[PDB]
Amino acid sequence: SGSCKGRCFELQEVGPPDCRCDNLCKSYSSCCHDFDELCLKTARGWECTKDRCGEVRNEENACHCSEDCLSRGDCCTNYQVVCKGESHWVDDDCEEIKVPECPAGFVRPPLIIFSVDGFRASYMKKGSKVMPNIEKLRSCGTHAPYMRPVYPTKTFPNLYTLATGLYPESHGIVGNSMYDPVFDASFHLRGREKFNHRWWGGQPLWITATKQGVRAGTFFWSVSIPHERRILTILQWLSLPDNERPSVYAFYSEQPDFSGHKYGPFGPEMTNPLREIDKTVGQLMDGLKQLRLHRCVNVIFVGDHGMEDVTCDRTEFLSNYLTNVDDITLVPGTLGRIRAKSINNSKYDPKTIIAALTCKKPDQHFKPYMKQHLPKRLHYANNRRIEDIHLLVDRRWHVARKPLDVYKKCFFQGDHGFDNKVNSMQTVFVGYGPTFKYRTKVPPFENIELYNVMCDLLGLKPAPNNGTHGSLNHLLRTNTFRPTMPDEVSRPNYPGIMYLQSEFDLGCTCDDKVENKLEELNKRLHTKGSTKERHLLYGRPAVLYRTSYDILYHTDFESGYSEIFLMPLWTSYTISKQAEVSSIPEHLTNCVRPDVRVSPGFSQNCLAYKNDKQMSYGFLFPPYLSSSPEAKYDAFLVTNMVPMYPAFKRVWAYFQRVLVKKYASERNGVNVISGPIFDYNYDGLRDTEDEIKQYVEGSSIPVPTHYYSIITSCLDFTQPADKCDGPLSVSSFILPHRPDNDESCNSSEDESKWVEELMKMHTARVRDIEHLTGLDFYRKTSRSYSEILTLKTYLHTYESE
Numbered sequence: 001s002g003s004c005k006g007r008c009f010e011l012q013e014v015g016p017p018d019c020r021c022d023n024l025c026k027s028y029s030s031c032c033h034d035f036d037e038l039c040l041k042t043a044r045g046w047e048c049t050k051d052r053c054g055e056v057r058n059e060e061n062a063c064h065c066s067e068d069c070l071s072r073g074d075c076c077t078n079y080q081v082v083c084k085g086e087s088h089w090v091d092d093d094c095e096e097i098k099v100p101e102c103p104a105g106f107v108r109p110p111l112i113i114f115s116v117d118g119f120r121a122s123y124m125k126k127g128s129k130v131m132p133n134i135e136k137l138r139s140c141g142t143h144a145p146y147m148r149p150v151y152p153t154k155t156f157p158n159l160y161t162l163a164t165g166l167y168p169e170s171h172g173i174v175g176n177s178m179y180d181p182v183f184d185a186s187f188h189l190r191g192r193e194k195f196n197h198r199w200w201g202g203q204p205l206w207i208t209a210t211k212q213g214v215r216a217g218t219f220f221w222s223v224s225i226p227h228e229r230r231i232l233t234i235l236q237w238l239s240l241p242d243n244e245r246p247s248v249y250a251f252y253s254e255q256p257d258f259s260g261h262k263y264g265p266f267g268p269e270m271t272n273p274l275r276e277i278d279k280t281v282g283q284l285m286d287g288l289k290q291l292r293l294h295r296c297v298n299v300i301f302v303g304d305h306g307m308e309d310v311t312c313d314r315t316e317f318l319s320n321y322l323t324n325v326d327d328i329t330l331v332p333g334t335l336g337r338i339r340a341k342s343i344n345n346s347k348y349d350p351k352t353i354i355a356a357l358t359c360k361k362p363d364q365h366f367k368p369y370m371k372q373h374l375p376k377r378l379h380y381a382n383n384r385r386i387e388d389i390h391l392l393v394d395r396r397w398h399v400a401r402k403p404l405d406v407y408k409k410c411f412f413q414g415d416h417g418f419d420n421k422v423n424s425m426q427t428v429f430v431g432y433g434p435t436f437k438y439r440t441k442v443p444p445f446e447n448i449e450l451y452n453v454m455c456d457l458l459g460l461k462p463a464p465n466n467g468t469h470g471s472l473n474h475l476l477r478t479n480t481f482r483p484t485m486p487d488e489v490s491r492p493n494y495p496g497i498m499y500l501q502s503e504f505d506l507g508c509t510c511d512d513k514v515e516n517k518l519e520e521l522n523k524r525l526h527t528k529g530s531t532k533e534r535h536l537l538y539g540r541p542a543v544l545y546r547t548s549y550d551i552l553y554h555t556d557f558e559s560g561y562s563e564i565f566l567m568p569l570w571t572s573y574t575i576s577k578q579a580e581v582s583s584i585p586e587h588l589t590n591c592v593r594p595d596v597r598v599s600p601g602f603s604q605n606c607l608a609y610k611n612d613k614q615m616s617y618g619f620l621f622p623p624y625l626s627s628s629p630e631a632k633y634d635a636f637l638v639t640n641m642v643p644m645y646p647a648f649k650r651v652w653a654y655f656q657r658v659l660v661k662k663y664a665s666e667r668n669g670v671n672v673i674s675g676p677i678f679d680y681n682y683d684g685l686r687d688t689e690d691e692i693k694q695y696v697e698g699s700s701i702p703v704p705t706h707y708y709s710i711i712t713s714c715l716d717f718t719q720p721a722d723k724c725d726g727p728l729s730v731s732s733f734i735l736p737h738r739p740d741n742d743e744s745c746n747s748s749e750d751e752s753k754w755v756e757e758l759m760k761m762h763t764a765r766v767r768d769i770e771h772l773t774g775l776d777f778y779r780k781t782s783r784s785y786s787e788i789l790t791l792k793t794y795l796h797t798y799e800s801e
């Protein structure tokens, strides 16, 4: 005589073999004997009808149309519509919600997270005619045109990111399928291992809430609970008394993802799943309205990822590239992860595998990487569950090991998982409620930001995460989070002229014996910082760690020079729309000049570069853009030199000689901050000096793993970058410092055919560069700090609209 009565969908999960009545009884195959009869009632379906109005409460029924259903909180959601002549929520005009309009005893507005699997961003416009409820939320509330998922653009990684504010590499759910070599265990969609708590790192919202005294409803719903029942359960929970009622709830829909896989993102069959999801939204909103909570609850309508057209004929097979294909294990599909089939195979060499997968067919539809060489914006490396070899797959394609795998399983027309900047992978965000703004459209943002906001909505302190708290304040009417700029840890030195030329023995020559007093005070003033206001538009960056460095001023650029790394941490310069490009004179071709402000012992030397047959050098401030022949000499200072592989110099030279001036023309001047990054342990964080794995031969000169640039101008491009009154515009890059161009399959062509495509692939947020350098940018603008935080999280994705 099993005991689920009274306990249907329990919040305090009890301990088996005492029988369960919650969303993980079904998932464990261990429900109390009568769960299905008591907790999954369906008799008479989900809608009141005229003839049910005022009925005699009968507890077999799925939901109720009896008089007493409201204070019980178990009416069918259309009860007041059918039996009281009330209107559907979707038929009421939008009215601003200026304050929460909540029953007494509510201590904060509840939050409902309505998550929709595979809801591609473009469905909001393309399906608007068949989703009236969703369209009301979007138009009346706060929405973005799209929301960026994390990579990989799969379900578990994304939903767990939403819950935690963490990148996959930090929370540990790095794919829908995974092998952990520490546990020696596999995580799969089908089956039970995925439930073990050691997979799931960070602190998800339901725990953050509970630890701070805020009760949560379930986040994981069994696939056997119909959607209408999930909705009714939420509404029932919302009717509980004060001391038991949760404040945060989640609803999950497996659609439109399930149908998008079968039919493709825009298959004609997709219209019905979109209508069904809208109806479910309408049920929730009508249900809240009956409870007088429709102007009390904050609702978030959010997806995990989009959906692209993918068919079994667009499959790449590794057996067409590798003679040795049976010696590897592939995690396949819309990304590839490769590891050895046996770790006892001493033959298995990842470099030979990468080499055999690189630019072998002319329109090859995947590109192989060592995971540390993946674009840093993906943040997809610092986890032992991520295999060393990664294949980034072109949108619309699959990769598989051998052809049998794809014909012992074309059944599907849709898939997802690709690079998170791909337009088809973008998803949705709408926020509706008293805490969200009214009829407001906000720019696109990343789903890692939402955890912080959900915490702000609930009055919770978020666990440490990868969002930038405050960057989404512009979504919110109140409960904004007002952070303070991080404190500078190291104050700069400001060295004057302290060394004579003969103190330097650098192996460096400069054939420059090229000797007024009007001009002599002029050069002195430039060295003392007289043009700094022009080249350092937003103040100097703050150094957020302990180190020794010098500010160096010049006519055309300013730098923060590290005595520890023997090069600039940052170099900052402004190029106006009218700047002229010039070429390096021959009296200066291999010229490098001692910097008499900086000791020989804290300087680079040219002999190390001569000796190092693989390493050459470039400059952070480009000599090509110097303002005068006198100022050009500053660009050849040893303190503006950085180590560069010759293959990388092709990239860098094209950027400096062609692209910067192009950007200045297009944007009405640009301010550029460039520098090195050292991330030898691929954790996305600045390396300390003891982490550096490579030096210029025979020297203490460390070799960067990457070079960054941050390119800022006026959002109103009719104002010049140096005289901007309002909001700013930025694009940035973190380019991999590689000794070959194997990544660029067209690299034998001229740079105008491949360098810009490389830079687009390695586009970056300012915030990414901050983590990687320990610098804080944009310290002195006339803009609000939250606006600046938004700017620092911006990613220029170079996708069409």
Ligand SMILES: *[C@@H]1O[C@H](CO)[C@@H](O[C@@H]2O[C@H](CO)[C@@H](O[C@@H]3O[C@H](CO[C@H]4O[C@H](CO)[C@@H](O)[C@H](O[C@H]5O[C@H](CO)[C@@H](O)[C@H](O)[C@@H]5O[C@H]5O[C@H](CO)[C@@H](O)[C@H](O)[C@@H]5O)[C@@H]4O)[C@@H](O)[C@H](O[C@H]4O[C@H](CO)[C@@H](O)[C@H](O)[C@@H]4O[C@H]4O[C@H](CO)[C@@H](O)[C@H](O)[C@@H]4O)[C@@H]3O)[C@H](O)[C@H]2NC(C)=O)[C@H](O)[C@H]1NC(C)=O
Residues within 6 Å of the ligand: 166, 167, 169, 170, 171, 172, 198, 199, 200, 201, 202, 379, 382, 383, 384, 464, 465, 466, 683, 684, 685, 771
């Ligand atoms: C994105 O946001 C996140 C969150 O803010 C950032 O991640 C943090 O990065 C911090 C710096 O790397 C990191 O701090 C370390 O924590 C160690 C203790 O960590 C444990 O406890 C915490 C707290 O509850 C917990 O969060 C951790 O969770 C990780 O591990 C579990 C497995 O048990 C996973 O389930 C979970 O997914 C998570 O994994 C991720 O992080 C770990 C590293 O912590 C990675 O290896 C995984 O791949 C994955 O990315 C832990 O359970 C602490 O020991 C470290 O301190 C060492 O270093 C300093 C140096 O001065 C020293 O003071 C310490 O004593 C210690 O040094 C000694 O140990 C060294 C290492 O063993 C040893 O080599 C030395 O010789 C010394 O003896 C360090 O403080 C913090 O853990 C994570 N948090 C999370 C959740 O990931 C992330 O950086 C952000 N990303 C970007 C790009 O900004």
Ligand SMILES: CN1CCn2c(cnc2COc2cc(Cl)c(C#N)cc2C(C)(C)C)C1=O
Residues within 6 Å of the ligand: 113, 114, 115, 155, 156, 159, 160, 162, 163, 205, 219, 220, 221, 222, 223, 250, 251, 252
């Ligand atoms: C295959 N699969 C997919 C997801 N799923 C299932 C059942 N129910 C859920 C929904 O899960 C969530 C919903 C939300 Cl909204 C958030 C947040 N934030 C987090 C989760 C996780 C997953 C528990 C982390 C299921 O069978």
Ligand SMILES: [Ca+2]
Residues within 6 Å of the ligand: 117, 118, 154, 155, 156, 257, 304, 305
């Ligand atoms: Ca999904």
Ligand SMILES: [Ca+2]
Residues within 6 Å of the ligand: 678, 679, 680, 681, 682, 683, 684, 685, 686, 687
């Ligand atoms: Ca690092």
Ligand SMILES: [K+]
Residues within 6 Å of the ligand: 609, 610, 611, 612, 613, 614, 615, 616
């Ligand atoms: K060299």
Ligand code: NA
Residues within 6 Å of the ligand: 741, 742, 743, 744, 745, 746, 747, 748
């Ligand atoms: Na190449």
Ligand SMILES: [Zn+2]
Residues within 6 Å of the ligand: 118, 257, 258, 261, 416
């Ligand atoms: Zn899917």
